[PDB]
Amino acid sequence: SRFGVNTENEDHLAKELEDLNKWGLNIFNVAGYSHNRPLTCIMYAIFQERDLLKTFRISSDTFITYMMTLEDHYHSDVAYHNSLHAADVAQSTHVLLSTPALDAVFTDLEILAAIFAAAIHDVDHPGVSNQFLINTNSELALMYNDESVLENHHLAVGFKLLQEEHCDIFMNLTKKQRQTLRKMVIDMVLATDMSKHMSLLADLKTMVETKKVTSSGVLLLDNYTDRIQVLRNMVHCADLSNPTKSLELYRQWTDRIMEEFFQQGDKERERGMEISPMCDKHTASVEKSQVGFIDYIVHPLWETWADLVQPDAQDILDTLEDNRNWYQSMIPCQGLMEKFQFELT
Ligand SMILES: CC(C)(C)NC(=O)Cc1ccc(Nc2nc(-c3ccccc3)nc3c2S(=O)(=O)CCC3)cc1
Ligand SMILES: [Ca+2]
Ligand SMILES: [Zn+2]
């Protein structure tokens, strides 16, 4: 196929894609059967399922041309922040959009924006933190004044690529649509910057305290401000959903991010940086740092999300608690979480 699917596993892929609308889709199998084109292959599936191609007159050719281009701007050598992660965040956002509490809430344009935002949110990620780029006086850091450095970059590159030959998937939108989508996308990607987590969660907390549903139990959002707030927390949840997938999947994610963190530690050493060495793979405690990560970041976010969508996210929340318990059981320089927390300042 134009996708990279051999006639061999075209049945394998279709069977894996039967769970396109599920939390337990396995995005790794999708990349195996697509020749490492998971982002393009899953985005195509998502757009078909939602009938977004026809709603917005994005021809297949334009969509595939843009997606394929987008996906090549992810770096396959970066262990976690590659096209598989982006594939996963998009597939995950696709599911969160369809939870019954969010049944008919969002316009097609809002759905288009959320999922697009998920696909581009990490494009051209060099595999290092914002703070690394800051401390090295990276051109990117200078360009965005050390503020949401990479998040700004992802947005820049994701829009830039619309301009390549037959890559403008938004060309048949009206001016008004394009301006609304853009503003929403910008707002969701910047919302994936971790130093904004706590302020993000502090507003989601509020939203829940005065939430209303229809007689159908569909959450009620009557002005742009509310919808974009839900949308941006949705994307950030998606971004932080690894620990809520099946233990088998979660551990693969953790393995990947730890490789990327350690690979960052090697660059810090190599380049002789700021005397404050992070722990290496012998000296770190990865398990302890996970439980630290889930208690401090992941669970408080997911618990508040589950509140908003009561009881839609319960199986998610229970799987989170099971996984926290598994990492918990496996527990025996500046540590991972110490380095994480210190660099929020
Ligand atoms: C901590 C440094 C290295 C400075 N990095 C950052 O601030 C950027 C950053 C990038 C990704 C994460 N995302 C993740 N971060 C962690 C983690 C964070 C701090 C201490 C120990 C672990 N674990 C996981 C993830 S994940 O859900 O992606 C995969 C599953 C486990 C957090 C932060
Ligand atoms: Ca990011
Ligand atoms: Zn991400």
> After which residues does the chain show a gap where C to N exceeds 2.5 Å?
332
Instruction: Report how this structure was experimentally obtained.
Output: X-ray
Which ligand has the minimum distance to the alpha carbon of residue 257? 1
Which of 81, 94, 153, 299 is labelled catalytic?
81
The resolution in Å comes to 2.3
Cα of 261 from ligand 1 centre, angstroms: 8
Query: What span, in angstroms and rounded, lies between the C-alpha atoms of 129 and 37?
Result: 25
SS3 sequence, the chain? CCCCCCCCCHHHHHHHHHHCCCCCCCHHHHHHCCCCCHHHHHHHHHHHHHCHHHHCCCCHHHHHHHHHHHHHCCCCCCCCCCHHHHHHHHHHHHHHHCCHHHCCCCCHHHHHHHHHHHHHCCCCCCCCCHHHHHHCCCHHHHHCCCCCHHHHHHHHHHHHHHHCCCCCCCCCCCHHHHHHHHHHHHHHHHCCCHHHHHHHHHHHHHHHHCCCECCCCCECCCCHHHHHHHHHHHHHHHHCCHHHCCHHHHHHHHHHHHHHHHHHHHHHHHCCCCCCCECCCCCCCHHHHHHHHHHHHHHHHHHHHHHHCCCCCHHHHHHHHHHHHHHHHCCCCECHHHHHHHCCC
Annotation marks residue 282 as catalytic: no
Could you identify the atom of ligand 1 that is nearest to the CA of residue 340?
1
Angle between helices 38-50 and 83-97 (to 10 degrees): 20
Query: What span, in angstroms and rounded, lies between the C-alpha atoms of 112 and 154?
Result: 17
Q: Please, which residues have CB less than 5 A from ligand 2, an ion?
A: 122, 192
Cα of 153 from ligand 2 centre, angstroms: 10
Cα of 257 from ligand 1 centre, angstroms: 7
Domains and CATH numbers, the chain: 1-345 (1.10.1300.10)
Three-point CA angle 330, 331, 335, nearest 5°: 130
